[PDB]
Symmetry: D2
Subunit: 305 residues, 4 copies
């Protein structure tokens, strides 16, 4: 009832699996990738570590039949952009990988929920949704969940107040164009303009600026997205109805008419997206969302399915 499949045993996929099994998110994991020896090595390494825990089942194979009956499939596979490759060509090369992966996941787990983590995550969540044939509420992307959490942490740190009392989200397109919803940020219910306790825009820039600096320094990110994926899996498996900013089907919210995926705070539970939190955005916040959706729709129109 709690089986999770992770596709891709690179840095992100292995950090996701390891976060999930050690944080007790699930005790039933499958890993799929194309490199048989690497897959078996990671499988055996984790099973040797399972020694420290109780009842953890791990499987791994190049054969997607190993994923059968998964409640969630987490997709981390993709390609890195080549120098001088266009944005559309990079999306298409990832799409061609997902053409192979996505229908196989659904064939073996027709009731699954998909969580897409491959970059660029918003358009590849749309692509995976289209390829899946699944309902819109059963396909999400890791989106801005990690950035929103780090945002709240940094606000909490500046204020000397626990993160559990500092509330707010980053929405929209993952990365530099994402939208800090300052109009909803509040500390114990007090909006920032109202704070009388014992500029801020840099905090958003910092969060999206640190994320790209990691890749330049160590070549990739792994731990933070791994923890974010583990949190999203827990919310779904435990039927938490907790709220997470994740890439989600956007058309029909915020006057957006383009069929795209961008991050919004979503109520997540066993059926997937139960509802989206409808934030009263300012016109400035809304216009940025619309601009991201328009540009993303234009790239999507060029994808060859």
């Amino acid at each position: 009832g709690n089986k999770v499949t992770v596709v891709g045993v690179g840095q992100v996929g292995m950090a996701a699996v390891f976060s999930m099994i050690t944080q007790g998110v699930t005790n039933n994991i499958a890993m799929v990738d194309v490199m048989a020896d690497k897959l078996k090595g990671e499988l055996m390494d984790l099973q040797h570590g399972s020694a420290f825990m109780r009842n953890v089942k791990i499987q791994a194979s190049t054969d997607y039949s190993i994923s059968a009956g998964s409640k969630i499939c987490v997709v981390t596979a993709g390609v890195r952009q080549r120098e001088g490759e266009s944005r559309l060509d990079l999306v298409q090369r990832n799409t061609d990988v997902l053409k192979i992966i996505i229908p196989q996941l659904v064939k073996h787990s027709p009731d699954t929920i998909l969580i897409i983590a491959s970059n660029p995550v918003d358009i590849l969540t749309y692509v995976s949704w289209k390829l899946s044939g699944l309902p819109k509420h059963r396909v999400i992307g890791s989106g801005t969940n990690l950035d929103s959490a780090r945002f709240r942490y940094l606000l909490s740190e500046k204020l000397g107040i626990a993160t559990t009392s500092c509330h707010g989200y980053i929405i929209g397109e993952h990365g530099d164009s994402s939208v800090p919803v300052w109009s909803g940020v509040n500390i114990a219910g007090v909006r920032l303009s109202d704070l009388n306790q014992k500029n801020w825009k840099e905090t958003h820039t910092m969060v999206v600026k640190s994320a790209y600096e990691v890749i330049k320094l160590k070549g990739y990110t792994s731990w933070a997205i791994g923890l974010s994926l583990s949190q999203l899996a827990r919310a779904i498996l435990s039927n938490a109805n907790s709220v997470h900013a994740v890439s989600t089907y956007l058309k029909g919210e915020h006057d957006i008419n383009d069929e795209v995926f961008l991050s919004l705070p979503c109520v997540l539970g066993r059926s997937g997206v139960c509802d989206v939190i409808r934030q009263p955005l300012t016109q400035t916040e809304r216009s940025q969302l619309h601009q991201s959706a328009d540009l993303m729709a234009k790239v999507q129109a060029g994808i060859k399915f």
Copy 2:
């Protein structure tokens, strides 16, 4: 540096002790009361189950010396209201008990923080503060902390959304006249006036207060819920969390209140006690209710024989 004393091994005090040691809040607990056999029996019952919890040092005695060096003293000792007993009579009977307890705690733990959990909690937090001689930020009462948790739970149940995204506080005087700060309620950053979700409101607060009294009417007392509440408050302080909790706190100087009373406000709690008070922009109706409660509290305080 994590020692907690619990005064009173009645239902509330034992639920607090059990909550703290089974949830890892502290590993160093002292229980004080006047009932020597009951203290020893509770001590030995908790010790008999030692293999089923983290290692903990537990002491129990009628001698307050075992409380020496406590970071927090949780005071749950007191009487239960008698049939027809007036508020003044009940306050004075509890004050008489506190006159014995409080100076002994402060003698052995001059640097302690007091958490008062006897009813009526707001006035008895004031009494304990006045008797203790301690700084105002080092004496709090359980206040509306549990009421506020229940408030957010009932919002969560009505909306189908986890309590971790349903935000709001009940402030003021614990009980029928407490104040739901509707103006600050928000769901994932969305005020109620702007809420547009798939899955009236004022009933929720009435449900919190009516069900609270119904517990006391049916079994005679509350124990489990308040025990968990006190364990959460102790955790916030011991762990230096700077988390926000609605607790009975020194009110003069907040919201233009000039009465030296204690009522609940959301407090930032850490190792020093109350680090700060969250200053909510109250509506006129919310503010006037707080003021009326403060005025009535001052009048009852003037009748207490110290």
Copy 3:
């Protein structure tokens, strides 16, 4: 499914429920007793505390129908000559047990009423359930405290001190010294008297009742541990009152504690310890006496 019903909302029953909900053993609890106002009072007190926790379902009623579909039913209800005391508890259980089995035919029974061994036998017989689906709290608590105190004396963590008390709960229980080891080293071999540790574990248990009137926290924690083992399918080993006939050359159909492997189906297996003649004679002496008392019970 993880629904647990606790029968009896006295001190032991409430301590078991509170341990289970706060230690995360289950999020689906039902409580049955005969006093409705006390029942709703406890229900509501726990529900208001669940405000601090995620999705916990609690029900409480004098009607056994609210126990329907329980994976485990924990029975703490009892009454305060020894045959007459056993008879009065049997009459109470004559009403309780058939109703529990009616509403949860696939349930496992954990009996906590005293005297636990004979009342586990009585519950099993009244239940019509397979022997592997009815256990008693038995010596599980005393064994755990025994290991803790050995560890404390040796200055080594309890997780490396191993051993069990078996047999009849209380003064006649059997410390199985032949199986006690520290990191795989038997006590006679330790290169880094003892009987007093067993005596004090059973002496302490009775001292608590004289001092505060009852025990609650320790047995509550023990019951929570047994429930977790069953619900999580741990196959962990716990000394519990269990069907004895056929083990250790016992021919009488009685219940006493042995270390049992506990999982989703109940007792998966019994750990078969090589007992000394003294250890086995004590077990047989207890079984012999239990058979004679059971022979006088009017069902």
Copy 4:
């Protein structure tokens, strides 16, 4: 406050798995990472901080300057080379010793009261090398040794029997790897020795599986990371929490089991805040003693060829 400060040396796959294990399992809230790769250190630091909302509050430092390790209670040493094709044991030991000659004096310079946990391979010899280089008391230097293999051993016994690992007891001791010693004389299930077991749900195969599967991991991905990271986190917790729990770790062996060689090999040790508080003295059989003595003999000879 550095009361639980851990330094991890080396931010390769082992060191990062140890760091991540410790901070996400709450073992310590104060960690320092030291290596020679400035950018990698900063990237790992920032990656872990980026995920700060998803773990308990923690102070993380990372630097090529060992000054950041000052006041560490434990230093976990994972830096080292990977054996090259055809490389002799002597050559591999000396290449790792060259690295430790740099690392160990710097650790004890900045944390004179620290405990060392050595995790580079070959762990038993390199624990001896680190002890000699550190000048620390014998009970304050240990190696990861056979702790993980003992846990896997107990897990395999548990899987064979259908009984939780918490009731399957036993240790592998001696030299980590092919020559390690399963202490069959001390293996027991809920207090019952294997020769007495009569339960519902070839024994030697279990130890062979543990050693052969460990080698296979290294052949397939090139290294182990997740399992050893969890093992190191468990050892750190035992020491930091003063647990006095028993772990098979590489430890000073002279004077135990009639061994006269100043070597390190794994024995079950009681671990707490002072380091090794005591060694569990198992009544080993002739065969178990023979294997342990042979490993100690050979290890003394390898140690004699090390150039300090």
